[PDB]
Amino acid sequence: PTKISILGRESIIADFGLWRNYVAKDLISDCSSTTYVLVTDTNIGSIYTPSFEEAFRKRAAEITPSPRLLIYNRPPGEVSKSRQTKADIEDWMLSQNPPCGRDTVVIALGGGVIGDLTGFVASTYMRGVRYVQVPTTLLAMVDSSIGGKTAIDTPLGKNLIGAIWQPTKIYIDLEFLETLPVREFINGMAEVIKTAAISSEEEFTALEENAETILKAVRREVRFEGTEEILKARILASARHKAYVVSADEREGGLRNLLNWGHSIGHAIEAILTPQILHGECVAIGMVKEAELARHLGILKGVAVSRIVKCLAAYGLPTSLKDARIRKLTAGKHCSVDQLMFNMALDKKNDGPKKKIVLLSAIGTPYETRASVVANEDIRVVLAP
Amino acid sequence: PTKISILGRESIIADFGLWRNYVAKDLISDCSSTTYVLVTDTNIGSIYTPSFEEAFRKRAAEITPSPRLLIYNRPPGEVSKSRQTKADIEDWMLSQNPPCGRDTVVIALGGGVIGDLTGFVASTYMRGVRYVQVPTTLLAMVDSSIGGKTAIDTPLGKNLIGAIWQPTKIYIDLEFLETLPVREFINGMAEVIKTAAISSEEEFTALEENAETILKAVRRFEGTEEILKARILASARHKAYVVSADEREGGLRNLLNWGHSIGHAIEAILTPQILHGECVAIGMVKEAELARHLGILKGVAVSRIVKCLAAYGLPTSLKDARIRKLTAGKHCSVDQLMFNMALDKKNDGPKKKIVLLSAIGTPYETRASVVANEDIRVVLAP
Ligand SMILES: O=C(O)[C@]1(O)C[C@H](CP(=O)(O)O)[C@@H](O)[C@H](O)C1
Ligand SMILES: O=C(O)[C@]1(O)C[C@H](CP(=O)(O)O)[C@@H](O)[C@H](O)C1
Ligand SMILES: [Cl-]
Ligand SMILES: [Zn+2]
Ligand SMILES: [Zn+2]
């Protein structure tokens, strides 16, 4: 049972089995309310909901009158982070009998999609209600579920409408990783590596050295036996550094830019290759190009760059828009430089039309304590595959 | 030039003419940015935008590269506080070339509708951008534009989705009142009276006295300017106070909702023919009658509440001939009213909360109070 603090509070609980025997109980005592709304997708729900309903009803029995638990199953996939889905969950909540009010405690059970969506619904529901995060994916456990950033996508782009709404509790249950598909697991490692690359060379070395052991466990269909503590240590280091940065610059006045390393170009790449290609994968290619950019600017050494590539490759992450696997999945989708530039214009870190990108000067230490303005011409160079 | 502080910042500026010769200049210096988005409705825009464009372009000529001013005209009326209009403005802001980014400074020019809408758009645009309020209606100047509450409506109700996003600046230009329709002016008085009724008997008395002078001018505020302004400011000052003490409404901010528990219920039915302040007027009477039925408020204060509302030309009953005509085909049954109050945002679970006054100028508690649904049924018919 490990606890991390963020923005002055110990909202993060990390352990194995939290879902089966801790969440329900904790919600009733620390998140007192008459109404609990659980949001997930048809896949995750069918596998983890039954267990929870009984754990909830068993903890609610003591309370009199017993609070209610309402479950909403959204379609799986990126398609659900939409205005439509936000509105559907909202109407559903309001039309309940009785309607869900401001005491409502929302529960986000799923990955970044469910998390981003659910968190956003909570921030604006009657101008804001409490919510908790229950990340079921590695990426969610090491990144998305922490920090309060929420959002949905629009036809014009990804994460353009949203809000920073901090969850009251963050339940990181490593047991969810037991059933997480190999690809998804690899996807999340992209964020783990990113987090280390901007904080400490020691942690990054740990990821390089742990690669094989981690991967073998992920590739063995049996699950993290003699590597548990190693897995928890890598996850926690990631979660701890984010909590640190978010605590110092919650609404991104500067420092929080760093968490976006590899995302300036990554998001551009993603807006094109999605949904066939995943977020972490895009961010992987993104870290390589942004690392190559820091090189083209005499900020980052050529050695660190190659090392960045070696680590991403070691965990099975693409490091080029030319990756054989990426092409087969996208049916050939081409990422034209002009398209990648147009998409980057919508990057949220931009100061006016000045494109800002996180630049590393060395593994473990950023160039500045924020993104850096970069001429559009210097960006064009690393965008050509 | 009066300045009021709220939440530790001197964001509120109050004066006559701010629009014509202060906003533009102030935005450029204190709200530095490359992009300015102005939102209004087709009516207000056509009358006040031309003036501003030139004042802006005249203040921008210095800065280089030149900062831009983008104008978006939304349809007038409550119909615009919708998910659709929120989406449209956002897509329009994201579609600009270059796209409006996180440095964007949004300008809400209009009443509560534009204000609530625009403020809400700013709060979630790329997770939040700055915005300023330029209230053109009395109600907006004395209430809506202050405090950060924003929202849009849904088919199921009013102000159900929204956010508390504080504006960087609040420009109260009394000159806008020069062209404000009599009805609209009366509408806003409903909030002025409410604010006094929950803060000071002294202020409420002054409102009782200025009743005729104010009305004669409304039915252009020459030898009464300082009277009007003093009334406006007292209202704005008390709200800033309450919002400072309880921003996200964890208690004391409930009081600003006096008359709104039943008021909003009434409104959800009679809207859009009947206005917000008017509904809140009837609402204040019933909630005052409720405090009486509970032995909290004296029968004298209630009647006095009625006299003041009537004096300013505000309805004090669902029967009121004026409301009747205006809404020929609409009734307010105890049932529909009750179903509507279920959606009140102050309700602690199924417990319906309502602000109770024990006397003009002093609330029963420092928050709304739970009230049995049966005690609410009584005053919901009159
Ligand atoms: O500040 C954050 O928490 C992030 O930068 C937030 C981004 C999403 P954003 O670029 O839409 O802010 C996420 O992809 C990244 O992994 C971490
Ligand atoms: O807190 C506020 O500013 C208000 O209570 C907010 C309400 C709107 P709400 O009931 O939708 O919050 C407004 O009508 C009232 O006059 C003042
Ligand atoms: Cl929204
Ligand atoms: Zn990411
Ligand atoms: Zn009101």
Curated annotation (Swiss-Prot), chain B:
GO terms for molecular function: 3-dehydroquinate dehydratase activity; 3-dehydroquinate synthase activity; 3-phosphoshikimate 1-carboxyvinyltransferase activity; ATP binding; metal ion binding; shikimate 3-dehydrogenase (NADP+) activity; shikimate kinase activity. The active site is at residues 249, 264. It comes from the Eukaryota. 7-phospho-2-dehydro-3-deoxy-D-arabino-heptonate binds at residues 127, 143, 149, 159, 191-194, 239, 253-257, 260, 276, 345. One of its GO terms (cellular component) is cytoplasm. NAD(+) binds at residues 41-43, 78-81, 111-113, 116, 136-137, 158, 176-179, 187. Keywords: Amino-acid biosynthesis, Aromatic amino acid biosynthesis, ATP-binding, Cytoplasm, Kinase, Lyase, Metal-binding, Multifunctional enzyme, NADP, Nucleotide-binding, Oxidoreductase, Transferase, Zinc. Residues 1-373 are annotated as: 3-dehydroquinate synthase. The keyword DNA damage does not apply. Zn(2+) binds at residues 191, 260, 276. It is found in: Cytoplasm. One of its GO terms (biological process) is chorismate biosynthetic process. The keyword Cell membrane does not apply. Homodimer. The AROM polypeptide catalyzes 5 consecutive enzymatic reactions in prechorismate polyaromatic amino acid biosynthesis. In the N-terminal section; belongs to the sugar phosphate cyclases superfamily. Dehydroquinate synthase family. This is Pentafunctional AROM polypeptide. The chain holds residues 4 to 393 of 1583 of the full protein.
